[PDB]
Design a protein around this ligand. Structure first.
Ligand SMILES: Nc1ncnc2c1ncn2[C@@H]1O[C@H](COP(=O)(O)OP(=O)(O)O)[C@@H](O)[C@H]1O
Ligand SMILES: [Cl-]
Ligand SMILES: [Mg+2]
Length: 632
């Protein structure tokens, strides 16, 4: 109702409070099932803290995304009555908002995985809650295996797994036929509306649908499912313009973006109720399917797309791609319009496309991703017999062999498949293996000062400010930073000139650089420097000898080597695929014979992102294992 306490007592889980703490008391492992918004994430930790479980250790609860971990920790600290970071806190990659006071901790799946490396028995925890398998992430499958082992060694610890009705028995059977606790909940009818014919521009169709709902449908807030941040920011801008073009005699539409890189002040706005005579539209990614729960939503706009990872078994390369959602996802999206009353779901696709062009459920992430990082993490924990690891959704044998082969050519593993000194040092950093490799190699190549900066700059969102109205001016400002040897050295030049200008916000404004992004890289750099210092890895500058930087990049990213094609674009060394230097690259107007790129991004063309010029001789010098029978 009105107060926080009344709001907490109106949640479906409240009716089962006593029986829930009794079920936890009676069972070491409990599978918890309940409709999204029933209070599983926010209340279970509080119920158990009240029952006295924090006296024995921390209560940890995993979250799949940054915005979810931050959002729930903030809400739970308000309900608990403490400071965020004190009794209730959160941990995400590069941001640990916890203290010696923390008894309730929300963390990303990846952060719990990093704690297992330090302490495989998770001795600091009395309770571990593994919050769902919304989409069965690699981290969920890995944490299930690690905690099935932890539960055997630790008879005192409690394990709570939240689940979907369809997954509950599979999770139960996995956890030694663990009991299932069901939170009954009211689900309301959702009118499902399909398009008569397929829509070309799903972004335009979704904006048209939002405006039609707003002006002609009874009060209730709208939830739009888009594919990413850039798309979301674009949707918001166009909708704002379109709504303003209607003039002042039109009811207010509160346009609210939702993405994992969202500033916290904008995150709180999505939970605020709309004032009378106004309506809000929440433009979100698939975080809004199960992770974030907004009250007052009665309308869902479903264009039918998710950005997910697709793996190539032959090349061993994975890539983010926009594909249709599974039917299970369509059902989850529609269900968001039926939580507090009957609602409507506008599917921007035909009924035939739902029944024929959509998979029932998606393939689990562990079966369509590169597993080099997973294998490196597992080997760092002493798990050498990968065939013995009890996975719920088993990865293909080919993917595990490809992962081993990749780490071996990186120099992380030996012939027997055991970690080398290199692999061990690589495992100490919360980074992708090719990034770890170039950082440890920069120590031996005498450019770790530069590499700490480059790795930190590569770990942040675009630092170049490019407003739609000042695109030509933005490019001229950026061109001043352009280094002849590529994008990585341009990132280094941006950071160093910012440092040399005493980390000035006005300098950033003048040069069209995002100060927030540089402050994030600065913070990441300090944390990476902390790991280097702990493990006595020397921090050395190359000075003017930036060829050392290029070699270190090449020692990690040789797999992404590509040679300039005489006709157009480039051809990858690995599979002779046609790839291109992006128009935003420092190398766009000075395309060299050989390059290495950070990643491939599919837009209109298959574009290389973050390109550095290389000498092909360095491929033999830094990746000799990666080359079969040639002379020269
Ligand atoms: N940051 C937040 N601010 C305000 N309310 C929130 C926040 N995060 C969650 N809530 C509210 O908490 C309630 C309980 O949700 P939750 O614990 O996430 O349920 P479940 O985990 O079962 O899906 C929801 O009705 C939701 O609106
Ligand atoms: Cl209560
Ligand atoms: Mg939840």
């Amino acid at each position: 109702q009105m107060s926080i306490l009344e709001q907490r007592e109106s949640l479906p889980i409240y009716k089962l409070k006593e029986q829930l703490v009794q079920a936890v008391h009676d069972n070491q492992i409990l599978i918890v099932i309940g409709e999204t918004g029933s209070g599983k994430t926010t209340q279970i930790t509080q119920y158990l803290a009240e029952a006295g479980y924090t006296s024995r250790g921390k209560i940890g609860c995993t979250q799949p995304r940054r915005v979810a971990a931050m959002s729930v920790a903030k809400r739970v600290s308000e309900e608990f009555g403490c400071c965020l970071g004190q009794e209730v806190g959160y941990t995400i990659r590069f941001e640990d908002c916890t203290s010696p006071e923390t008894v309730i901790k929300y963390m990303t799946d990846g952060m719990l995985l990093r704690e297992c490396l330090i302490d495989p028995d998770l001795t600091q925890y009395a309770i571990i809650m593994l919050d769902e398998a919304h989409e069965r992430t690699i981290h969920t499958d890995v944490l299930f295996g690690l905690l099935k082992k932890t539960v055997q060694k630790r008879q005192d610890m409690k394990l709570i797994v939240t689940s979907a009705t369809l997954d509950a028995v599979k999770f139960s059977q996995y956890f030694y036929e663990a009991p299932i606790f069901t939170i009954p909940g009211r689900t309301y009818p959702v009118e499902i509306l399909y398009t008569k014919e397929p829509e070309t521009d799903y972004l335009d169709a979704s904006l048209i649908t939002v405006m039609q709902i707003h002006l002609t449908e009874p009060p209730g807030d709208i939830l739009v499912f888009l594919t990413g941040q850039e798309e979301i920011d674009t949707a918001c801008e166009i909708l704002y313009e379109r709504m303003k073009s209607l003039g002042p005699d039109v009811p207010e539409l509160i346009i609210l973006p939702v993405y994992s890189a969202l500033p916290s002040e904008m995150q709180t706005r999505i939970f605020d109720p709309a004032p009378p005579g106004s309506r809000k539209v929440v433009i979100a990614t698939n975080i809004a399917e199960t992770s974030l729960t907004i009250d007052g939503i009665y309308y869902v706009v479903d264009p039918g797309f998710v950005k997910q990872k697709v793996y190539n078994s032959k090349t061993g390369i994975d890539q983010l791609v926009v594909t249709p959602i599974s039917q299970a996802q369509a059902k989850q999206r529609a269900g968001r319009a039926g939580r507090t009353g009957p609602g409507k779901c506008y599917r921007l696709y035909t009924e035939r496309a739902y029944r024929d062009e959509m998979l029932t459920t998606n393939v689990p992430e562990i079966q369509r991703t590169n597993l080099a990082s997973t294998v490196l993490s597992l080997k760092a924990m002493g798990i050498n017999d990968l065939l013995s690891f009890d996975f719920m959704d088993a990865p293909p044998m080919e993917t595990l062999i490809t992962a081993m082969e990749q780490l071996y050519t990186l120099g992380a593993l030996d012939d027997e498949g055991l970690l080398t000194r290199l692999g061990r040092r690589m495992a100490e950093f919360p980074l992708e293996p090719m990034l770890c490799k170039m950082l440890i190699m920069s120590v031996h190549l005498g450019c770790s000062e530069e590499m700490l900066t480059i790795v930190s700059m590569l770990s942040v969102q675009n630092v170049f400010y490019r407003p739609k109205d000042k695109q030509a001016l933005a490019d001229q400002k950026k061109a001043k930073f352009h280094q002849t040897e590529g994008d990585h050295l341009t990132l280094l030049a941006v950071y160093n000139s910012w440092k040399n200008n005493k980390f000035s916000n006005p300098w950033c404004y003048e040069n069209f650089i995002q100060a927030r992004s540089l402050r994030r890289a600065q913070d990441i750099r300090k944390q990476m420097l902390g790991i280097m210092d702990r493990h006595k890895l020397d921090v050395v500058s190359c000075g003017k000898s930036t060829v050392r930087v290029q070699k270190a990049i090449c020692s990690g990213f040789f797999r992404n080597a590509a040679k300039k094609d005489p006709q157009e674009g480039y051809r990858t060394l690995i599979d002779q695929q046609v790839v291109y230097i992006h128009p935003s690259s420092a190398l766009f107007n000075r395309q060299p014979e050989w390059v290495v790129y950070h990643e491939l991004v599919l837009t209109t063309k298959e574009y290389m992102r973050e390109v550095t010029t290389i000498d092909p001789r360095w491929l033999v010098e830094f990746a000799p294992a990666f080359f079969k029978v040639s002379d020269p």
